[PDB]
Design a protein around this nucleic acid. Sequence first.
RNA 1: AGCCAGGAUGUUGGCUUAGAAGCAGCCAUCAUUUAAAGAAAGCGUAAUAGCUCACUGGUCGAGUCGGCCUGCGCGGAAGAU
Lengths: 176, 286, 38, 141
Amino acid sequence: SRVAKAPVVVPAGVDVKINGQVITIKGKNGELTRTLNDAVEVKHADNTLTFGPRDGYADGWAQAGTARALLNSMVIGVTEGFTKKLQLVGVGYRAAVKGNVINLSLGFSHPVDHQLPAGITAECPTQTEIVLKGADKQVIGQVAADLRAYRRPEPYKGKGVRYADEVVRTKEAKKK
Amino acid sequence: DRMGANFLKVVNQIKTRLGANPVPLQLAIGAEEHFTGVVDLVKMKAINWNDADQGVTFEYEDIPADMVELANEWHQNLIESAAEASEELMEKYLGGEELTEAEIKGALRQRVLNNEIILVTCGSAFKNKGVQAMLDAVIDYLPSPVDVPAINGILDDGKDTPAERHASDDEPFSALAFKIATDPFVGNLTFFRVYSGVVNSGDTVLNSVKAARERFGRIVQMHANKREEIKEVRAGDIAAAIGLKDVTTGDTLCDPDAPIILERMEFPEPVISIAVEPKTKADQEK
Amino acid sequence: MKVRASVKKLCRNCKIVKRDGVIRVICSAEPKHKQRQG
Amino acid sequence: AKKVQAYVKLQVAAGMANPSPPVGPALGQQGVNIMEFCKAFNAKTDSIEKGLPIPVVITVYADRSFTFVTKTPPAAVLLKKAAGIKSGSGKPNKDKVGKISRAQLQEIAQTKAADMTGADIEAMTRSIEGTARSMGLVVED
RNA sequence: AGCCAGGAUGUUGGCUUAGAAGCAGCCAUCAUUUAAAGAAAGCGUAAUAGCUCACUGGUCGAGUCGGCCUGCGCGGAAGAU
């Protein structure tokens, strides 16, 4: 397949701990482990990692096809990182980072300050731009999408919290 | 006292959209909710306001320590604004003669008769934060009826001789007719303003642009609402030139054998036209 | 999500994936083109 | 010459100084002073009797620059400049009015031969016969 | 199937020209170059600038694609101690 024609090359600076089904990757700034399913046959062969679908679970081409895409992201996420910037377009809406906490100037009668978990070093260059930094590809989206779900992109003004690369489709009033 | 209310943005937005040259004076102290000081920059003094009272204090102090450098970089642009207003302050911006509070306004007041700079002030009307501050600039940056070019009655049709008349009481009388409201007591009313001269009570005030004779009744002043009968109208009051038989937009209110204005500029056009219809047939009679 | 018995691939870029078993059709810019039953 | 940034050939009769609203956007693409494209071409526009759409192309450059290529008017409007009316295509294969022979077509092709490297003489001859049949025009020599 | 990737360019494609300027719609429906391009599919839109389909022109470097017939499966499927 395309995934079978896709092996991943681990570089120096990220150590694997192959206890069979449980792999804990000792990396640069974290520990990106995934306890996969038993539809995989893993082997860090020489340097480039090779994998395999186990018999019986012949649908493990899917279940390890996740894994081939997975561990490639893990060895490049623990070292380099993800810049996940969000664009705050709100009338009187600010963003400021302190410790691991983000403020949410969100047009309410009360402030919303939610604490953010490990795997996050957040920053804020201004009141409308907010950095998020992380090692797992999941955690760099999950903490980002929760903020965006508190104020979705409003398609009559362009109001809302929105991603850096995301482009909304704002409409027009057309009646009054 | 609102979110998104950046003072330095808006005054420096005029230089982009309106294309003007504003140099502001009274700056901002406070993060818009704990806001307590308005930074007057000539005297370099912050003003305390009421805890929540409708108007107790006016307590002036120094520049606070949390804005000791933004007062530094903005005062040096204030004292620029007289070296390029008058040519005489050009050589003491660079020589280093002291630019006091009293010296700089003598140049900038003459920068209001040409109007290249406007004077800006941040504060709250409703939170009683700035209103007591805003009054002292009016006597020093807004012009007086005796400091301006006064009544200038030209002629009639003979020759274009524009004549600056006197702003004192030593002239023929002159006024103008505007804001001519109505009432179910006397009928027609006015909100007129006299520029110079004194009128007594009872006069043959004409309207010399449309050739009509009127007589000057019982003049009444207001608190914008309440009838207070102003008998003797001094030069500069605003009152109600009552009992005008016919009066148009902006004609003169002047005794004969005197200078005369004839001026109506920019007569508008009411555009949207809706047709009113009566309810009863007794209504169309009224 | 409008519901009707017919999922007809209507918009020009209409994805179809079987989430939970019930089909719901995924457009990009048109929210109006998204049905769910059938 | 250039690539995916910008390349559109649109200009109509150069007697009109103000950019016509539909032409506007091809000048409204990469930030021009519209007075510059009015002052570029008028030094040579006084060598013509105006009335035909003359074409130019636009092509762009990095900072605020731009460029343009001058050619001669096309033979498609030269077919309907001599024929009197500017629009004859009402029914292509049902109208038989109006003859011009090949000799007129090549002398409006030498001004193509002295201007451009494509639109060659003998190859365009059937398409200058092809713009005749769609308009409902006849040709004999 | 994606990243580079030109969207080779005669033309204004008429009519009726107010814009119906490939993108409102009826008749033509040729193509100057054909290793890549149609007098044309939508969005941007009064018109177009923006973004593509067109051939994937160069890279990956193997399989892949749209329908016909049947074995079964899912949705359709909401009722009253």
